[PDB]
C-alpha cells in the first residue's frame, strides 16, 4: 500500500493552525522557515548551524536525527536554541545528550542515512611538498613513499602532478588572492591526513576482484591434506593474490614518408599482419542503434567511431 506522501519533516515543528485568508502559506514552507531561522537585511540565515563554514578541520555535516530537527544555534557562542510559544527564539529547557556524545566515524559522515559514505581526508601542503621532493630530488620509488606515508601509488602520482602545476602557477603569478582564500577555507573545512595514525592510513593491499574468484568452488581434499592460497590459485587457474598485488604496485616496423618542401603532411606506415588489418566486410552498423559508439578527437571534438 503506497500513497503519494508529501514529504513533511519526520521531526516535530510548529504547524499552521489558522491564518489570514490572503497569505496562502504551506506547512512545508513553515518548516523550512523554522529550519532556516530569521533572515538578515543582508540575506544571511545567521541562526542556522549550517550557514557558516567551519574553521576547525572538523566538517559540520548534518545531524537531523540527533538534534531532532532543531538546527538553530547562537552564532557567537554556538549554543543551541528553539522556537518558543512566542515568535522570539530562546534556549532549550532540556539539554541534548545525543549531540554531546558523538562518535569519530559519524563526524566524517556527510549524510545521516548512509553510514558507508565518508569524507576522504585532505593532505597538508607541507606533506605534499615533502612527497614531491622525495619523488623528484631524492629519487625514491613511489611504492616506498606510499608505504612511508599511507597513500596509494596512483594517489601519490596525482599529488605529484598537482604540486608541479601549482609551482608553475606560482611562477606565472596566476594563483590569485581570492583563489588562495578559497583554498584556505576548503583546507579548514576538511580533516587533515595524519601519516602516523594507523586508522587514517589507506589500505595498500587492496587488489581488484576478478571474475573467476567470485564464482565459488569447493574441494573434498583428505582431512589431513593441506591446501594453501597457492593451491587455491592453481585450482582457479590464476596467479596468486600476492603476485597480483606486487604487479599492481610496480617491436613493429614503422616507416615515415619523405617530406618535400611543398607537401603539408607526412605518411606514417606501420606494419600489420594480413587477416588482421582492415575494416571488415559486413560488420554490424550500430549508428541507428542506441548502443552506438561515440568517441572523442585529439582536439576534444565528439566523433562517431
Amino acid at each position: 500500500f503506497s500513497r503519494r506522501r508529501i514529504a513533511y519533516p519526520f521531526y516535530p515543528f510548529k504547524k499552521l493552525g489558522r491564518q489570514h485568508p490572503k497569505k496562502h502559506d504551506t506547512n512545508l514552507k513553515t518548516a523550512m522557515r523554522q529550519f532556516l531561522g530569521p533572515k538578515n537585511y543582508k540575506g544571511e540565515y545567521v541562526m542556522n548551524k549550517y550557514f557558516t563554514v567551519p574553521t576547525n578541520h572538523v566538517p559540520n555535516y548534518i545531524k537531523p536525527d540527533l538534534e531532532r530537527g532543531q538546527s538553530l544555534e547562537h552564532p557567537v557562542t554556538k549554543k543551541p536554541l528553539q522556537l518558543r510559544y512566542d515568535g522570539t527564539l530562546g534556549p532549550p529547557p532540556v539539554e541534548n545528550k545525543r549531540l554531546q556524545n558523538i562518535f569519530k566515524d559519524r563526524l566524517l559522515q556527510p549524510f545521516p542515512s548512509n553510514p558507508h559514505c565518508k569524507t576522504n581526508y585532505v593532505l597538508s601542503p607541507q606533506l605534499k611538498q615533502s612527497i614531491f621532493e622525495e619523488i623528484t630530488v631524492e629519487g625514491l620509488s613511489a611504492q616506498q613513499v606510499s608505504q612511508k606515508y599511507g597513500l596509494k601509488i596512483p594517489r601519490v602520482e596525482a599529488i605529484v602532478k598537482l604540486v608541479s602545476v601549482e609551482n608553475s602557477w606560482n611562477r606565472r603569478n596566476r594563483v590569485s588572492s581570492d583563489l588562495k582564500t578559497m583554498d584556505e577555507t576548503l583546507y579548514r573545512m576538511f580533516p587533515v591526513f595524519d601519516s602516523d595514525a594507523s586508522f587514517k592510513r589507506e589500505n595498500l593491499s587492496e587488489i581488484p576482484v576478478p571474475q573467476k574468484t567470485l564464482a565459488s568452488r569447493f574441494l573434498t581434499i583428505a582431512e589431513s591434506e593441506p591446501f594453501g592460497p597457492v593451491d587455491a590459485a592453481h585450482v582457479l587457474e590464476l596467479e596468486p593474490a600476492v603476485e597480483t598485488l606486487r604487479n599492481l604496485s610496480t617491436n613493429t616496423k614503422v616507416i615515415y614518408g619523405e617530406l618535400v618542401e611543398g607537401e603539408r603532411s607526412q605518411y606514417k606506415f606501420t606494419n600489420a599482419k594480413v587477416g588482421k588489418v582492415g575494416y571488415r566486410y559486413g560488420s554490424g552498423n550500430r549508428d541507428n542503434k542506441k548502443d552506438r559508439r561515440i568517441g572523442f578527437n585529439k582536439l576534444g571534438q565528439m566523433v562517431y567511431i
Binding site: 614518408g257 607526412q266 606501420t270 606494419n271 588489418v277 549508428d287 562517431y304
Partner: protein, 116 residues
Amino acid sequence: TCGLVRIRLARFGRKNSPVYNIVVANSRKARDAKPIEVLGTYVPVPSPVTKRELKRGVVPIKDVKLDFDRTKYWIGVGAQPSETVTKLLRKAGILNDAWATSKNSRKVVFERMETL
C-alpha cells in the same frame, strides 16, 4: 589502371568522414565489395596538430597501417596499383621512381627511415 588483379582503395566509414581500405581486388567486382585480400587501411584526414606544435614546425601525419610483405608479393605477381595506391606505396618506399607518372615528377626536407 590496367589489369585483372588490382591494388586499390575500398571506401569505408561514414559521410563527410572517409577511411579507406587498401585491398587487392578483381577489376570487375565493385568498389566496396569483398576483395581478394585486404592489405591495409588509410585515413586521408591528417592527425591534427596543436597550435604550439604548429608554431614549432611539426607536420601532420596520415596513418597508413599496411602489410608490407603481402603488398610486395602482390606487386611481384603483377597486380597493378591505382593512381592513389601507387603514390602511397612510393611514399612508403616499396615502389621506385619508375612508377611516378609525368604529372607527379622541389627540395626534400625530411628523408625516409625505418623505425621501431
